[PDB]
Amino acid sequence: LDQLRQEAEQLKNQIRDARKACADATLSQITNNIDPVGRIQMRTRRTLRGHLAKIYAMHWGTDSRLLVSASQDGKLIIWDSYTTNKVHAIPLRSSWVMTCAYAPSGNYVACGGLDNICSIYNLKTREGNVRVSRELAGHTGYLSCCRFLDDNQIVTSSGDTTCALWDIETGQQTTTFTGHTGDVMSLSLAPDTRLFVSGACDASAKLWDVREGMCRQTFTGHESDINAICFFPNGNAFATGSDDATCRLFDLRADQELMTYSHDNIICGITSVSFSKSGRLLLAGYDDFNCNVWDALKADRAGVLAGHDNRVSCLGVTDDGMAVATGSWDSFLKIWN
Amino acid sequence: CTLSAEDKAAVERSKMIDRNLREDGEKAAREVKLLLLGAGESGKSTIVKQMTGIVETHFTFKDLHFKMFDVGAQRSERKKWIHCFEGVTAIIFCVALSDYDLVLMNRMHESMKLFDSICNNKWFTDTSIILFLNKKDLFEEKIKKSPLTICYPEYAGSNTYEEAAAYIQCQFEDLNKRKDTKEIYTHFTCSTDTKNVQFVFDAVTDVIIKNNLKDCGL
């Protein structure tokens, strides 16, 4: 037992030494010659109303016209963002929802929460209604985020240190990922649809490969828990936020930390993070009752998109990159460009 | 208008959905939500009987609709999940009396720590608590042979049931630190009739009256 612990400590020291030897130059000394974006301002173009309680998640479609939103009233709504209309309203069985997803083929949606069950709904039928296609069960805690991998494969992460991959048609798990110690809060699929990364309540993140099931790599460094993770457009980076008023930029190949986004006047929490269509703007949702826009390569700018009367809890960006949607606890949803 | 027929049909659809949503939401703000809490094996099963994931129980009493939520099945950290209960009318807390000597560090001190952590939480600075003390028969039949100094050295009172009950109740109620904003109600868990629901009905009526008056700056 002692020999195993000594070997583990030696391996950790060797990994740290290799990482230190792999760090030669920093990007903070390269972007000093880059012209900044300058002042960036945005204006409310539409305002979507109809929700009553808070808003916990939202997700864009694959064509940048249709929208999905989930509230604590046990309500799911499908909107059109070009004319401010309602295309569908879906009821729910459990009013405690914390995540949603939109199928890339425009056919299915998903919901989940504190009931430990993931519900999958089918949109296009012959009777004109929306029906409950599947109920996936097998977790023991609570679901935090669900994404559609393809039209017949789904991925879930829970608060039992477990991530799972499901085959919808069968109804049964095909692979399970374990190795965390605390709650898991986020995951973000890659464009090539072969890997995914997840962050835990223990100031750590892990990168996983789907086909095999073996944990690929582990990153640490935050002072406290990690609450939001997004994923870079090219598939070779990601950025995370903690409940410490701090954001970080990690890479999957250099195996080290790159940039830190923090400021002395910010002492609240971070609830969501997203990128832009060219990897030049980073949008963050804080608890100061406003959002923020960061220059992803220079790590200094504070272009507040204020306008909410409570905490901003979700945001998203279109596929063509021509709008930004924000949702907060004030029961309204706003569109920016 | 400058629209085709199909767009007019679309806006009619949207208006109809809006009406349905408003009706449902208005019908959904006419009910009482209570959150249950207690220590491990505190007898709260008796409370549920007399009246995985989240367990939701429903009942209707004297023209009110009560939703009780039981959260005992969860085992994760309570910090990242407790915020979704900001709008509750009341927190029910259940504590055991006949577990002062059993050590798991007895049960009484763990219950005290849990109460002191819950009552001063930031999300619950205006939410009332209903406190149940239960398992009193074994308590009355246990102090005839065991002294209260086994866990309360400072106690110097009579070896009678009433003095013990009063001391325990005052010790618990002394934990509050927001005396000007929210109250605390106490009751000994009965086992012979339907008082355990009447007490909650009275508590929620009083909470409604005080919220109504204090929302008007009166």
Partner: single-chain antibody, 230 residues
């Protein structure tokens, strides 16, 4: 999904007649309902429209004020009532569904029609018969009188088919799309005010009468019909 109509018959001049439609197998409270007419040996003709919520009711420019349209939602029944019938209303009638939101496909399911016997942008079909041979490519074109590309970017022409002794089924909706249950060997395109449909690799059960409609604004106008025969 099954709509069945009833009520047809023989009537003397004048009098009255009520026709009913019964639905089974879908949500009758999210679909608007049209009545369409077909002459004994001519093209189709638009008649009436009733919508979701009973808010909007249109009528024909010919017999307005003489026809009565109504719906009953809990029992799922659609009613038409007519009085004082002349000789111009000896024909067959069809009930059609439509639902309008972003992405839908109107005029999807038709009925079986009923028979009644009594003792405006211009659509004109170019031809009347085209003899063909299996394995050949066919183009069928019709014409209009004003532009159909609405400002928002749509296009509102409909291409329908009819085989012998049957009821129509939607081939192309909004002049460029493909419906459900239809073989993937069809196409349709047009240059403003004149349009053409293309069929490749002909086969049996693909011979009959083709029709082209508009829906830019009420009322809607029909054509004579193109007969494709072997």
């Amino acid at each position: 999904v099954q709509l069945v109509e009833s009520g047809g018959g023989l009537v003397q001049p004048g009098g009255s007649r009520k026709l009913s439609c019964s639905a089974s197998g879908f949500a009758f409270s999210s679909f608007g309902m049209h009545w369409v007419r077909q002459a004994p040996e001519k093209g189709l003709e638009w008649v009436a429209y009733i919508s979701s919520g009973s808010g909007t009711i249109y009528y024909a420019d010919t017999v307005k004020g003489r026809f009565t349209i109504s719906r009953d939602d809990p029992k799922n029944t659609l009613f038409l009532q007519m009085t004082s019938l002349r000789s111009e209303d000896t024909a067959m009638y069809y009930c059609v569904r439509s639902i309008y939101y972003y992405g839908s496909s109107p005029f999807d399911f038709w009925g079986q029609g009923t028979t009644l016997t009594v003792s405006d942008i211009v659509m004109t079909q170019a031809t009347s018969s085209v003899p063909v041979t299996p394995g050949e490519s066919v183009s069928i074109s019709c014409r209009s009188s004003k532009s159909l590309l609405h400002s928002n970017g749509n296009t509102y022409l409909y291409w329908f088919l009819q085989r012998p002794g049957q009821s129509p089924q939607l081939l192309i909706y909004r002049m460029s799309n493909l419906a459900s249950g239809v073989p993937d060997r069809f196409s349709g395109s047009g240059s403003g005010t004149a349009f053409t449909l293309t069929i490749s690799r002909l086969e049996a059960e693909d011979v009959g009468v083709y029709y082209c409609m508009q829906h830019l604004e009420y009322p809607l106008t029909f054509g004579a019909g193109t007969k494709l025969e072997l």
